[PDB]
Design a protein around this ligand. Structure first.
Ligand SMILES: CCCCCCCCCCCCCCCCCC(=O)OC[C@H](COP(=O)(O)OCCN)OC(=O)CCCCCCCCCCCCCCCCC
Ligand SMILES: Nc1nc2c(ncn2[C@H]2C[C@H](O)[C@@H](COP(=O)(O)OP(=O)(O)OP(=O)(O)O)O2)c(=O)[nH]1
Lengths: 58, 368
């Protein structure tokens, strides 16, 4: 419309569809981060990186 | 102190020894488990030293058996060149560059003038240092006293004797002193030290009795070299340690009997020195409160890695001890790809270890 009403601008309408990676990026990002962090610990201790997968899963 | 005859039987621990090989003892462990409750009359440290080839090992084993003392075999380079799985690192030396070639007592007796001698002497000090700390953990956690053959305190004699013969340089001696100064102050001096004064001519005869291949063939054990050790033990080491530890001197208990020696030790009294607080004799082991006991126990049980990290003293102006960068890369390749050196001990699958997927545990006071 020809009008610039700030309240109209803020107000949502549901038209926007959030991207596919949006509801999963933070879970998946942290999940990979946790595993990768566990990979250092073994590497830091000169253990086989995939040894003790219990800590990776945790 | 109280032999089996005095007690009439085996040592009776006051309380169950703490499993110091498997469980750590940090501050929060110290709240529930106290240290002083386990200390007996036999909770002491004994260093059975002497000249070269004086039968110290045989005397120690017998002695440590009578006093119900733990016996710690003298350190040797096999502790560095043999990994846990048993593989011999020295087999890898054809690959390594000459400077990084393995060096042992055999080599020292055969090419004493090689620049790796300075390396070899520092290793012995480092090995004794780690072993000495291990004895303290056993003492403080179990209450059973320990019998050592040569403490790190007495190790500088060999370095000093080697220096007088000219095997070492000025720089190597300068480096050694800084390591010793940087590290020695953190130990607890032994309660008792026993010396076996074999005269110089006797030890020269005695060495040929062992009929060890390299020793007899060698030139190092000269009158001058063996004489230097005698002057160093008595004038520098023994004169210094006696200010803290009780000192017994025998011509050779290795050739003599030990039952007489144990009966000599038990005569020595260890309480007369306790009266004065600041008395130098056995000052180190005088803890007023239970907190002080636990602090010392924590330091050696839980902070040994700190103790073994003080050996990092950077000194590169000395050319003998420096290892060239090109060699280091090559040496790193060969050394750490050998069977059993890929990973920490207890994880190398190719050496037969199993269950690594479900394995997460590592040893305490263990490497890496
Ligand atoms: C190369 C790798 C570099 C990694 C740098 C990460 C920075 C990008 C990022 O973290 O966000 C990217 C974004 C994920 O988030 P998004 O899909 O926009 O939805 C809202 C999320 N709650 O998703 C994207 O923008 C896609 C592109 C980057 C991630 C693939
Ligand atoms: N360069 C050097 N050699 C040492 C040192 N300590 C011991 N050795 C060498 C000197 C001799 O070649 C050889 C003598 O070994 P030992 O005197 O320790 O005899 P061992 O303990 O095997 O049994 P024994 O003494 O007879 O009871 O080891 C050291 O600190 N520096």
């Amino acid at each position: 419309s020809a009008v610039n009403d700030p309240l109209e601008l803020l107000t949502n309408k549901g038209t926007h569809e959030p991207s596919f990676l949006s509801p999963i990026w933070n879970p998946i990002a942290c999940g990979v981060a946790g595993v990768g962090a566990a990979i250092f610990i073994n590497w830091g201790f000169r253990k086989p990186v995939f040894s003790g997968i219990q800590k990776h899963i945790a | 102190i109280s032999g089996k005859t005095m007690r009439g039987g085996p040592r009776v621990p006051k309380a169950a020894p703490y499993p110091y090989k498997t469980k750590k003892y940090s501050v929060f462990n110290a709240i529930f488990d106290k240290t002083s409750k386990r200390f007996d009359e036999n909770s002491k440290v004994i260093c059975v030293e002497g000249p070269i080839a004086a039968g110290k090992s045989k005397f120690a084993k017998e002695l440590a058996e009578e006093l119900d003392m733990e016996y710690y075999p003298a350190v040797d380079l096999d502790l560095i060149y043999i990994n846990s799985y048993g593989y011999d690192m020295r087999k890898l030396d054809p690959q390594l560059p000459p400077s990084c070639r393995s060096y042992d007592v055999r080599n020292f007796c055969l090419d004493p003038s090689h620049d790796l001698a300075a390396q070899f002497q520092i290793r012995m000090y480092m090995l004794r240092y780690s072993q000495y700390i291990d004895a303290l953990q056993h003492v403080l956690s179990t209450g059973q006293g320990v019998v050592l053959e040569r403490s790190p305190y007495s190790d500088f004699v060999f370095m000093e004797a080697m220096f007088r013969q000219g095997y070492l340089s000025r720089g190597a001696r300068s480096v050694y002193n800084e390591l010793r100064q940087n590290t020695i102050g953190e130990l607890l001096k032994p309660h008792l030290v026993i010396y076996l004064d074999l005269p110089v001519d006797a030890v020269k005869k005695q060495i040929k009795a062992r009929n060890v291949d390299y020793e007899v063939q060698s030139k190092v054990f000269s009158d001058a070299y063996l004489s230097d050790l005698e002057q160093l033990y008595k004038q520098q080491y023994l004169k210094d340690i006696s200010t803290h530890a009780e000192l017994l001197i025998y011509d050779w208990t290795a050739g003599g009997e030990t039952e007489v020696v144990v009966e000599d030790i038990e005569r020595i009294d260890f309480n007369q020195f306790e009266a004065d607080i600041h008395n130098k004799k056995m000052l180190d082991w005088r803890f007023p409160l239970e907190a002080e006991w636990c602090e010392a126990r924590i330091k050696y049980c839980h902070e040994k890695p700190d103790l073994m990290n003080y050996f990092n003293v950077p000194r590169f102006d000395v050319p003998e001890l420096v290892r060239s960068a090109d060699d280091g890369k090559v040496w790193r390749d060969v050394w750490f790809n050998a069977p059993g050196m890929k990973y920490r001990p207890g994880y190398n699958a190719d050496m037969g270890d199993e269950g690594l997927l479900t394995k997460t545990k590592i040893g305490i006071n263990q490497g890496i």
